[model samples]
Target chain A: MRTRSTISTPNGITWYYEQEGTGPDVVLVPDGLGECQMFDSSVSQIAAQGFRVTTFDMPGMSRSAKAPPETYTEVTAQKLASYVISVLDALDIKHATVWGCASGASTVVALLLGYPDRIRNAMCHELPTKLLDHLSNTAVLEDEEISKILANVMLNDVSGGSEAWQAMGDEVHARLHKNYPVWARGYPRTIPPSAPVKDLEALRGKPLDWTVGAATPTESFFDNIVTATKAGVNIGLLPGMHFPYVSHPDVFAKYVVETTQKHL
Target chain B: MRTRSTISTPNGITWYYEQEGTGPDVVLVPDGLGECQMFDSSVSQIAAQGFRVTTFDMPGMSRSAKAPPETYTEVTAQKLASYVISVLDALDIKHATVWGCASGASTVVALLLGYPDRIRNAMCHELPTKLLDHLSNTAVLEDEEISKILANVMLNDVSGGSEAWQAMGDEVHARLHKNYPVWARGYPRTIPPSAPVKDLEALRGKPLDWTVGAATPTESFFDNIVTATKAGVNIGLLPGMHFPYVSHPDVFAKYVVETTQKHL
Candidate 1:
């Protein structure tokens, strides 16, 4: 059974959140792309594995109360940390496992780092440490640059106008049409990248599991892997590219269950 | 005849500006509050006076295309001056007098300073030199402070929730519901402010007529009078408060006509 409701933030923005299944809690944060529906099959699959799965659309993106870019336009990591805490407090959940896909997985690291006492464990999927570094730096570029980046990212199709790119563009376009480039302003891209070993060293409480996909070659992200090995990151793997859960939900769910059972 | 149209900017934003009557062009920039409807009666009265009156809702407000706050979030003076120029170019109005109310009035001064060769004259109402000084200095603030200022400013009522405040609140609420304080984000109000003598000195082209109302007192704004006298700004007066045009549109239109006739 799934329960859905709107949670109001202290700043008057109302966010929509949903939960399903009947076990330990796990919150999912989708990449900067897709709405909450992007993870529909993944949610159901993980829920079927006896885990309570929950997710929400980012502010101004989907059914949430819309706000101007300036409202949540600074200290984005801090804001996401606070919003996640607010959601947990609103739901009366003291502790929960967290998972994030791609760019959102970077937010998972922020959550684990900022609210270590609240989050028990985290699964950050297909996120390169380089991306996190980029996000931490350039969240406040001028509008022209921001708009250009958004346009480029939207059309940067490796699928070369394939059905996958078209489907992805349509889904991304709907959310952007609602909020524009406000929430999708800055993206973290690794600068000659590492796997965030220095960031990992700052952690002392709850553990974070770095989840990568077998099909998602780490050639360009080998620097991250080297850093991860040295930092002793708890590594997990699935069967597909970037969004393995979207494609291999059953395997992804089983992988999540097995991984969390060891660390949760 | 009132003609309404959408003007596209080079940056891809389509703005809604309206023109009425048929005479010398006069572009109106209302105070940072209210939509283009903020000056409907005033526009009609001026248009009736054989003046081609035109005005528009700022970006992300009213019927104009909405954009991220970061889009117009820097060097606001430059952005607004450019927008006014763009409006004129789109309308094919090579020369026109511009009038701006309160904060919008300061923006008119910015227009004169930034595009000295393009404007004919200016009517800036109820804006003190102090405000211009502030706007020239700061156009961005922390998100937390910006949010609080927006909420407080919207709720500030001179009549303690009178019909006037209620009516004003309802109108502002509609625009805020759409953009949520992005346009009203970076107001640089200062305590013990100073006249923008530097900005005033930069004006080497057209004359700017300062219009203040009898009801909108300026005991602390004597610095503006002294600076305007030195800077040779033409000073005009009206019968009512900050927005005398709203109350006495006919009289306001006549004042605009008499004032611009000498300059144009």
Candidate 2:
């Protein structure tokens, strides 16, 4: 049975979510501003692998209820992590394999660290561990330099996305363009560093995997992979840039199914 | 010597800070949207009590260079804590007493946990420990209910503030009104939980003090004080509402001086 709906927390904040297929449960959390629709292709593909699949827009994203404006000013991994757990409770699912990308990946790490018991398996793709070093390194960039870096990364990611993926991406960008400047400028300083080494230490025996795009091996990306590997997390390199699941859903689904099977 | 200046981080973010008096080093981090000037009365008083005191605006606040718009979306305590350390480094101070209020208090806790070696003493006044329960309980509130709460808290706090304190508060609100809605909606979800019990446990040996308004003891406030006290932190109840430093600078200064002297 496939289902789509909204759940209102007692605080009145609402979340838009989708559930489909049946078997072991799987949850997919998209990157910042990415709604469940962004994962349409991958969700179906992964669900077909005999696992129940769920996806949701984080609060204040596309279909979810807009959180109060100040929320955008300080999106901590702890908050997002709590939201994920709250969704699971609302759905009455005690535990599930959780997968996330970019900022969502940071949330995945937070789940692994803060609520290890609720996470059966955790997968993080293109986690922004670089931000962990932002205070020490990146925050000094000139505006133009920062802008250029953003443009370059987005362009590369977009180039790798499929047409449908591009369409959804564009729609989300249009809907949240005004927030883009603030999110871009503040995310580096505001998002928790994923803390790969320390977090992985706490997650020593947890089933966890970290992945990055094989084609986009930036210094930060390689550094993150190395750090996670040293800390004992399984590392995978998928095809394409940041959005491999959007660009190559078949490959992404296969990888997810394979790794998940190992853990299950 | 009393001096005001701006210091640029290697990443180019500029902070506006003031330094006064001379003795043991002390750093004050203000609450969200509070510029350094909000602590004017308290800073002077604390500095006068035989200690060199420093105060600064968090990046993107008044008198500080605005961070990229996105930076506001996810302000993490880790980031803010790093900013505090960065300021200390810029001034070539190796260790110092650190004090904060509300959101700033959260940063102080982060420093105590993440950079213990650098903090000589720590004080958190009116730390918003209530938000730690936000996701589990408070997030369920209706919009009207949340608004009523905000109104009540702000009214109570404003009523207790002195004329000069009121003026600074008004100026900051006016300057950042455009961001208030987002900030109000987002801050609870975005700010890291003060995690009083767990944090105080980790801080058992650390010289730490947590204070709240004696006249305004909400359930969460009392809960936090009890939790911290049980976990070995010293607790204080001062006169006034949220901004005791703003309304009772003399008492606030004495608290800082006495508590700091104990630790030193």
Candidate 3:
């Protein structure tokens, strides 16, 4: 099976994952809302002929998105951490390292800080530098300004997609337009290496105490204490453009394997 | 599936073969024992994205051993030639003009003489100098002497296996001790690679004659012809120890691919 599961979560949510190798367990959280197939080759190769690897679509991801709207916000990160602990306990999969890709990195940072002992070490890669600060400034704004900005964000129609991904390429292109590029063009869909989450899912159920002006360009604005560094995350990057999970599953899996090996 | 296949004849005996990547259909004839796996990472990569390749375990090889017992004998070159033709025909493979390896090289010389149309252009590799001619000089000797010499070949067990394969290793290892190396172990798998026809069903109804004997080693016996430039066969030693398929799949495949590309 390209993917390994279709299990139901307690909140009546259902999720999925795949296993590789045979040693200890490692939970892989992809860059934003991403699929596990991204790491197919590497996962198979790094299973160490015996190490066990488990990767699943996150709560707000392709298959599991059917769950009620719980984003990777601070509150969501906490709940997700609890869910992780439960998963391990329920499945009897003790001793596992959590792999956080991109925004998932930010989520783990928050989870580690919020639930300190729940994690061992973590790696953050290509995290948008402005995510936390953006959330800070957004908190203090009046509800009107918040509505106006959100209105623009929601009404924005992106390009049909014949150009760059949301990495430096998408970032640069979007800045040039001062508006979202057309997500309709299927910009990142075929790229195979680009993250799929857009602005909406990233905003679900953030911790209430996360912002300042009541509005910000990104989700976790003003969230200083929640960064991966603050939580001592054992972050990393594969050699390539952002998102090694998609660009190089082989290298990505190897990194996870090596890091987990260090602790195991 | 790993290697393409074909069928051919020599001394009224029919043989089967397989191959991939084309420029010169470098036919490989096993030493006269059994078939072995030839299509491996090396062979596959050699063909690369281009290059038509053909290969099959020779008659009595893997499955090509389907010939009647009476059809088998100590006559080496004729049996080798028969396998070569079968390899070519089974896959509807085109004629080879540039290269062949090991025993297949010897048979190419025969093809050039007997079926010049097929080997009009070919580059053969790792050919022992007059190997078969030397075998013929002693092949007619008393069975006791042959038995004693066969002891060494038996001890070494030259025949079969491709890649890390070593099961048939022991079985063929013992049988080859009787007379000679059936495609010597380690480096000579190329002969069998060019002509892998291990399936008996393909040979069930075919006619086979293994009775051609000679007093000269294949290469040395053909020395005058090779030196006269009348043989028009281009044979050389490859830089690898074993068949180079394992030691250098990508490299060998590239060489084969390029050779075929140049000729094509």
Candidate 4:
């Protein structure tokens, strides 16, 4: 069975969510500033593997209400983790495996640190190592530094590819342009670079996995991979740069299910 | 005559502006994250003094169209200065005296640096000296640091006062809450902390003045004051914390006209 709905949280934000299949739950958290639609293909494939799959747009992204500016003042990780739990609670799912990328990946780390009992397995792709560095150093990043990092991340969207991949990329670009106004509103602000160092250290032996695309350069995610590994996080490789799940949904789905079963 | 209209810029942003009175031009730029309406009272007061006054919402705030996220990658000051020029071009004004506060003040600095001939006199209230520090050190600020600074700035809005002042504060707060979604979209990202040190140095002999509210703690704006002073910028004081122009429009207007006359 497949269902979709919107949930209004106590924090005054209304989230749009979709769920499919009927088995152990699997939650898909989109990239930090993207809509849940990015996971459309992957959600179905994962659900077909005999497990339920859930995906939702974060606040201020397509179909979701805009979070007030005051919300950004709260700790990014804690606030995001709470929102994830709110979704689960509304859906009546006590716990589930969760996967996310970039800043969304950082939120997965937060769940592992703050709500371990509620997360059966945590998967982070292209974990925000740069943010981890910022947190560890207790320093703010310069505007230019942030712009450069963001530009690098956006590069993945335009990386040349086959016609089919290009079409998908084009679709994603269109949504982004249409939604950029709302997305840019609380982004980078609402996104913590990474969990605090002490909190991450607590994830030592947790069922956390950090993965990167096989096509992505080592330098792009090297720092985060090292940081996650030090925290006892297992490392895995996917099929493309920044968005393996979008480009190779079947392979990505297979990896997710196989990893979850092993953890169970 | 009082007139309001919107202009389409070559950069793809449509800006909404209000022009009043007639004489030499005096452009009023609001705070980094506010609307042009905040200048409503000050506009009439300033315009009555034989000078045309122009106030407009920054892109993505109020009536202005939301700027695409890609627009944020450009240097904040340069882009803002360019927008100011665009507004001026649309109004057929070749040069003018410009006044701004906080990040908006940083735009004034950029104008002084990049378009010296276009700005006859520059008045910056609560200049963003912290950004100047960041530029000089070439470092990024921690998220916590940014938040703390912002909170301190917001505190001024709620500081207790007379019923009349309270009413004005209430009005400002309501607009902020209402427009926060659009305001947060490109703020801080589109706002540079300060201009480059070398660029500021070029203002050593330029016609520039930096002012602070009489009630604001010196500690709050001390850093920026020092930075501006070193660059040959004169210092002045107004009546309120953050919104002196709104709180004491007549006085603010008188000060502006007197300062411009001295420069002329």
Candidate 5:
């Protein structure tokens, strides 16, 4: 059976949540960019393992509340947190694992840095940060580049639509890998076509640079990630897409179960 | 190589068709309620086997002619036929295999009836259809009922999405069972969570009810299917998800290659 609750945040945005199963509470926050429609399968597997599963629809889409026109001008880490924290409190659930994907990954990292106590564990997948420059000259992002992205996301959100902005937000944080399309859930397809250029792109990206198209998780990022490990929060990557578990649920469900079970 | 041609239809819809390989053609269509990404893996697999493969996005989705709001409606078999006829006419090809998914299965049947001379054979993996009542009352679906299905698919898709859908679709359309989840492509994934339910569905469907499922050659519907069998049409099911070839490409590649290679 499915049950839902509305989390009317202190900030005026009221988010809708669906809860199922009975046991310890696990709040599933989809890629900050995506909604909760697709996580049911993943969450059920987690719930079936014997745990209460709670999934929230963020402010921009689905059943969640949409932010005021003036909100954030563009979605940012803090705004996302405000809603996330509000949801947890509204539910009166103290401490849980916080997960993020792509842009959400960075948002999760930013959260860990600011409110380590609020989260028991923090997980980040494919956090696309220019943070790698610290690891090697290969992975640093130019201030100008970051500025462009920030501008792009903001503009897209302000003009196209929230979901459109969400898509652009994910693009900066995830990737459309040419060669390894099978790594995540690809759009449902019939004939698998090959564009030599795409084949060439995947080969070229062999993850050598860790810059152009591959997900780059860095030292400080790991250090931030390590905070969750220290906080007794388990964190990981499921060889998933920005939304790996949702995209390629078949191959990755076991890993998801593994992670959720560990949390339990 | 990726090649696509566009056909201007009498209905004002532009049809985009891409074809490759040699010998017979597999006029392919996709059934993704929201996504229309192509699968180079599957297409190339058939191409490797020598059948020139052609694929197109259904109307109202990716790359296909976008039906305007006034003309809005989900894609239908009639559209597949219209687009298909245009493609066949343009390419000067006659009677080829019709390959599709959920909404696609209907397209296969429509082709079989509409342009009987235009279809050489039909190979479907986990085709989705509610026609089981018309096909056969295989005890499985009868016993499970729609709720069980809604739950299984909901559980699986919610738990697995495309993974779960593939398994269910494969089950609904047996004969192509093992070729499901396209596990024949590879098996890196722990057999999907929904495989059992799908197996049950397929095993039941195969009890023989072409109108319902199970491609039994002598069933009344079988007589109709067999009439089209020609000297070299394949009417059967494989085990696994609908497109097991993609999920487990290696094995599927082997089987598809051996099968299609002979046809070429």
Candidate 6:
């Protein structure tokens, strides 16, 4: 039940990827930490909903080597776009819908802006439009603090564990503990708030939806993009916080399939 | 194959619990976030290493109702002390070894200090003795930022996933997303690094070991405690970072049994 592939980027970083199920090809770009495995359940959920799902680890995350910290700057969005396109080319996937969560949503936006020809549709959940807030909040945390907090989050919150363990699996935690300190150093700042969105008009040629949780605060930011580009931004309101996919995978997967299928 | 129980705390919060395997009892207390499921693998690892494993959700973590945020202070150590004892008394377990990781190690230290009779041998890994470092580092982050970072950690790092899908499983992520905010709010500062460690001499009468990752920097902290107590502190070192058990479960489990058996 596992299909994996690895490709080396022009920048000299190797990326690991997974492809599963069958239907229209949909590439799932990961959010924070950029590990394809984070969306494992949602991949199955969406795959069962009638689509081929592709997911991968970005450079400096689990499967990928830690690239130069500079490589993960705001420049990462564009770099990721080209690398993603290369992945599709390698897989013979000429065109595919793109799915991203949190900061991954920023990458989706960049993809639409720079590489519209390659994408059929794009779905972004909990998009962080207020880059100032994110940068400001994280600018003050020490690398160790970031690592420990994130380590706790991974071991305790996501592990499907009870109060006793909260320990991520041995292999997963080891890889992360080893590599993520550098990943955390540059990951949050990858999408600078000052990036250009005024030229997002190219996105109107395809289906694009900006999804947010009921409590997300990027409404005005999202609205501005829709109005500026005159693109029909399918704004989706899910009944949860930033990660509706984590708590409501069924609803999230079903919504993605139904919404993207309409565009296809 | 699974046994779950629920108990009501005097604070009006209901805690859900799980116990599996068979042999001398071992209560697994989680680190800061306090979810027991994080240890799911190590539980099985230790179970096979010859011990009945018991794990549970702490207040405001997965499966436990959120208490007032103010309630999760350093005072929480004492509160958890009584709660852990209640679990032992309810299960009719007269004695057991106690295992804790990271902040879970903090709880174990507190259990030993507050209720030594309930525990036989206490083993704590990656114990953060430099409380000032912990507090100073975390003092800069906003709660929302902390939540997001931790959430990603759980999703990407903890799941028992292959290279393909790092799914933390639907049940686990859902509960964490739902409950961990309150857990995060007061959780980090609960066990202040500056708290007094001199009183640890009370532990001299029993078997206690404080462990750290070979990479962790607490030589001063460990040395101070050993010199302060003169209680042959079984200062154990594992060849890893914070959660060594996750990556080296077989070694960790076997070490736990062999180390504790010496004390018995």
Top lDDT prediction, candidate number: 2
How many collisions between residues are there in candidate 6?
A: 26
After superposing candidate 4 on the true structure, give the runs of residues whose Cα lies further than 4 Å from its correct spot.
A70-75, A131-165, A169-172, A189-200, B1-264
Clashes of each: 4, 34, 104, 7, 50, 26
> Candidate 5, after superposition: displacement of residue A173 in Å?
21
Question: How many pairs in model 2 have backbone atoms within 3 A of each other, for residues 3 or more apart or on separate chains, i.e. clashes?
Answer: 34
Residue pairs of candidate 1 with colliding backbone atoms: A130-A190, A131-A188, A135-A188, A195-A224
Per residue, candidate 2 scores C-alpha lDDT tens digits across B90-181 of 89878889888777888898888888788988898766655555332433566456545544456554435656354666665444443333
For candidate 1, write residues A1-264 as lDDT tens digits: 778778876755677778899888888876654257656667888888788988887765677635444334542445566666776788877878888766566667778887877887888766555544334443466645654565455445211223433455465555555443554453343211322336656643348777555543333233333344445665545655565555566777777777778765
Model 1 lDDT on a 0 to 1 scale: 0.61
Tens digits of per-residue lDDT, candidate 3, A1-264, equal 234766665665566667766676666765443455555566776676446767766554555555554432232344555555555555556656676644555455455444545555544444333423333454355645544453343334111111212322433233223211211111122211222222322323321111111111112211221232223222222444334554445666677666666665
lDDT of 6 by residue, B1-264 (tens): 557778765555676777888888888887666666666777787777667888888766777655544445543455666666766776777887898765567667777776767778888765545444433354356766656766765445432122212333667656666555555555556554523244656656656776655433323233332332244455546644454555555666777878767766
lDDT of 5 at B33: 28
- Model 1: what TM-score? 0.42
Q: How accurate is candidate 2 locally (lDDT)?
A: 0.68
RMSD of each: 23.6, 20.5, 23.6, 20.8, 20.6, 21.6
Task: Report every candidate's CA lDDT.
Answer: 0.61, 0.68, 0.43, 0.67, 0.44, 0.63
Candidate 2 chain A: 10-residue stretch with minimal lDDT: A130-139
Clashing pairs in 4: A140-B140, A140-B141, A140-B142, A141-B140, A142-B140, B129-B224, B131-B193
- DockQ, prediction 1: 0.00
Error of 2 at A3 (Å): 2.2
Instruction: Report the backbone clash tally of model 3.
Output: 104
Residue-level lDDT tens digits of model 6 in A1-264: 558878775666677888889889888887666666656677888888778988888767778664554455544566667667776777888778998766677678778777778878888765554555533454467767766776776455442232322222466556666445655566556564533344555556556786655433222233332332245455546644445555566777888888778877
Candidate 3, true inter-chain contacts retained: 0.00
Ranking by lDDT: 2, 4, 6, 1, 5, 3
